[PDB]
Amino acid sequence: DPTIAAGALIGGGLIMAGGAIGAGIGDGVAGNALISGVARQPEAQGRLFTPFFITVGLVEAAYFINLAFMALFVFATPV
């Protein structure tokens, strides 16, 4: 068995590694356009949160789906 437990920890660690790369860069890249948009015009700050939180919602969906599959590999290992 140990082998399968080591494979689960490495496989789960890959899933959360790729999750944080997708999330941290995705939110930085989306938030760069929020900061530049508010800088471009402050009165648009209220409207710009809609395009931003749609984008952040899509980026975080990849993160929390990866969090669920890491938790499944770790706590409910499929073999």
Binding site: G57, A61, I65, A68, L72, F75, A76, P78
Partner: protein, 220 residues
């Protein structure tokens, strides 16, 4: 614990078929034609439209203006009814699964199995495929094998995007049930809310990419 791709099955002409899921695509098929019955019931032309009439209209004028640019609406008006029927049938086939029947469930999106999905992939393909030869009987030959890859990849893409996307939800609604019940309702509600949105946007993408592949088939 969890096992992906498990359905009831049976055989009707020597070939195997699923006994499960088929009911789910049948409820969807009944609901789309039943809604239409209501449309003809309270369809208005010089008065105030019903909720079903304004709903579909909004879809119909969306799909009509999208196809407008893809190809002359007259060149191929047959793309419009195909686009709205693809949209509404995939939309309800995704949403119907917002009815949890875990006991194992009973109401599972047909998009869960690739069969319900290779269809919208190969039917759409044979559709614009013939439209292309109906119409006409790339930039660099040095790369032309990549076009053959691309045209083989279009039905694969359509299929695997719709399959893998709704199938992810089909796994996640089972995965969350391993979480204690006194808390699991919160991530369950959050996932169901996201799966309504993604279930609609997936239907929108499949309808739009259908129109755009008809356009690429029928241009010149």
């Amino acid at each position: 614990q969890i096992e992906v791709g498990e359905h009831h099955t049976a055989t009707w002409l020597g070939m195997t078929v699923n006994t499960d899921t088929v009911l789910s695509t049948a409820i969807a098929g009944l609901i789309v034609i039943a809604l239409a019955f209501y449309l003809r019931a309270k369809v208005t032309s010089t008065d105030v439209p019903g909720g079903v009439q304004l709903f579909f209209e909004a879809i119909t004028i969306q799909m009509r203006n999208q196809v407008e640019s893809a190809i002359g609406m007259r060149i191929a008006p047959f793309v419009l009814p195909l686009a709205v029927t693809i949209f509404v049938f995939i939309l309800i086939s995704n949403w119907l699964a917002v009815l949890p029947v875990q006991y194992t469930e009973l109401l599972k999106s047909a998009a869960a199995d690739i069969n319900y999905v290779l269809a919208l992939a190969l039917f759409v393909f044979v559709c614009y495929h013939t439209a292309g030869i109906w119409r006409r009987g790339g930039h660099v030959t040095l790369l032309a094998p990549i076009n053959l890859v691309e045209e083989v990849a279009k039905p694969i893409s359509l299929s695997l995007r719709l399959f893998g996307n709704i199938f992810a939800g089909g796994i996640l609604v089972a995965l969350i049930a391993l979480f204690p019940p006194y808390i699991m309702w919160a991530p369950n509600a959050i996932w169901k809310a996201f799966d309504l949105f993604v279930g609609a946007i997936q239907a929108f993408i499949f309808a739009l990419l259908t129109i755009l592949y008809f356009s690429q088939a029928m241009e010149l």
